[PDB]
Design a binder for this molecule. Structure first.
Ligand SMILES: *[C@H](O)[C@H](C[C@@H]1CCNC1=O)NC(=O)[C@H](CC1CCCCC1)NC(=O)OCc1ccccc1
Ligand SMILES: *[C@H](O)[C@H](C[C@@H]1CCNC1=O)NC(=O)[C@H](CC1CCCCC1)NC(=O)OCc1ccccc1
Lengths: 301, 301
């Protein structure tokens, strides 16, 4: 028993992290087979990053402008190219630690593990959710760019996030591994800000099911609402509408606890209106929305 | 910026996890050089574990009663022995992934990362504190025994916890890697319960410093208390007394924020007496005590 915020074991991804240096800038790259993936803003000069033209900047580079270090051994770049906001560096050595992997673009509300790295060296691992406003609430310092987020599915590593920048509110923005930003953000230093967030309803409900599986029942009641009357409550408290798809995704947890989804919704409704009154749920005094139904199943059985 | 509950990267420890089978019981072992470490209760029968005599049980075993699998390749045991509550299995193959490592017995209040495993295979990683009552609030299912807790210090893995059992309140108890239980617990199925806990004061204060470094200042005030008058408040709210040693450990964080420890204590005092009034600190609506001063420094610079 017990319920903790859990990341995937990071070993398979640790073997892929390298350091990429271009001129004065250093950040992390992902070394998969004979290609290194990293943010394209590594080729930005400190002056020409208010509005850079990346196709010109890259045409003016050559393979010897890029220094790649796997551990201590230097990697020689034999080709370079750009795909959206990621730079791709062909190296002469295939990574012998390359796992089975996929590139996946995730939906808001999904979670992943982040392996924060500095200078090619993994520093720590933690779990993150893609917020509805396409930011993540990470923990990233200077030099963390190129750190990746990932999920694991029977030794296949699904990479889904590469880190590029911090927004003014302290939250973070980046791309999928094919270089497309999540959300409306762009890789130039301008006035882009995170939009207003909403709470991921299906995750809050999954977390309430984890609380039930772990013995916290004080918030249950006998009431049952309908979908339509619940979503009116969600709108008032800035929660994502509950869809039929979400109800069905919650099925296994509903079956394991014997509490129907719409029964669990009438408990959430009471919590939103009356608060917790000094009680906690799974060690928290607020409603938590960064556990997917999948995360709950994986940890509660 | 940002502050997240962060585990150490688990790769160095993943390469050490094996599966140990004795009769009908299966749990995880730690394969370091040519020795496998696991809980000694793996040799317990389901009937003779209300009060077992482990020296007799082990005398009645032979090397072929133990099955060790590293991945898929079976390991042959060429020796066995017992040290306190851990079993040690000599195998004929040294682990070629053996990192630089130490065995360390930690103090309450210290944190470590837990690599939860089932059947020798790492499942997830999370951070834990040794509570003052020598339990940990983990997340462990059947078959998790032998999962280890560890810290990393420049590629030297310091193992400090091996998992043995769940207590009635859902918290967890285990040993150091030399087989000595943390706390008063013993490895037989009896009526042992966790004692009353206390909050780790020095950690709460480190977490308040992390909040300041990250822009949460609404709880600061101009008051400054003394050590003696603070510890009277700690006693009333079930907090560990603040020692002079703790004050000095908080020095670097005090220096980085320019807020003296005894200044930060007068903010904690106000929070304990008046609560948060619907505000949060680093995304939490209660005071958090599972970040050491070291964890804060490592993540805030
Ligand atoms: C890459 O390593 C950093 C990571 C940032 C710095 C602190 N926390 C992070 O997540 N990325 C950058 O510094 C960005 C570089 C720009 C990105 C757009 C194209 C040109 C280059 N800038 C950035 O994140 O700006 C905000 C910021 C906040 C706090 C400290 C520094 C910068
Ligand atoms: C080993 O893999 C398990 C891990 C436990 C089970 C669920 N969560 C855990 O942390 N350990 C055990 O099952 C213990 C075995 C005993 C330990 C004392 C010596 C004889 C063998 N027992 C145990 O933890 O009992 C409590 C319990 C709670 C919930 C489910 C099962 C057991």
């Amino acid at each position: 028993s017990g319920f903790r915020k859990m990341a995937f074991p990071s070993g398979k991804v640790e073997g892929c992290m390298v350091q990429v240096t271009c001129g004065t800038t250093t950040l992390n790259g992902l070394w998969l087979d004979d290609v290194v993936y990293c943010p394209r803003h590594v080729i930005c000069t400190s002056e020409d990053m208010l509005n850079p033209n990346y196709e010109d900047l890259l045409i003016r580079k050559s393979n010897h402008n890029f220094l790649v270090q796997a551990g201590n051994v230097q990697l020689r770049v034999i080709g370079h190219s750009m795909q959206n906001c990621v730079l791709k560096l062909k190296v002469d050595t295939a990574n012998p630690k390359t796992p089975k992997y996929k590139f996946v673009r995730i939906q808001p509300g999904q979670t992943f593990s982040v392996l924060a790295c500095y200078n090619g060296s993994p520093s720590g691992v933690y779990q993150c959710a893609m917020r509805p406003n396409f930011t993540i609430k990470g923990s990233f310092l200077n030099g963390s760019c190129g750190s990746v987020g990932f999920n694991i599915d029977y030794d296949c590593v699904s990479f889904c996030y590469m880190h590029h920048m911090e927004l003014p509110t302290g939250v973070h923005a980046g791309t999928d591994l094919e270089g497309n930003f999540y959300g409306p953000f762009v890789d130039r230093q301008t006035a882009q800000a995170a939009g207003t967030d909403t709470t991921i309803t299906v995750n809050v409900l999954a977390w309430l099911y984890a609380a039930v599986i772990n013995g916290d029942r004080w918030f249950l009641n006998r009431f049952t609402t309908t979908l339509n009357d619940f979503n009116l409550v969600a709108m008032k408290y800035n929660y994502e509408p509950l869809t039929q798809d979400h109800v069905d995704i919650l099925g296994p947890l509903s079956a394991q606890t014997g509490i129907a989804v719409l029964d669990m919704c009438a408990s959430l409704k009471e919590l939103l209106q009356n608060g917790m009154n000094g009680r906690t749920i799974l060690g928290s005094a607020l409603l938590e929305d960064e556990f997917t139904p999948f995360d709950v199943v994986r940890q509660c059985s």
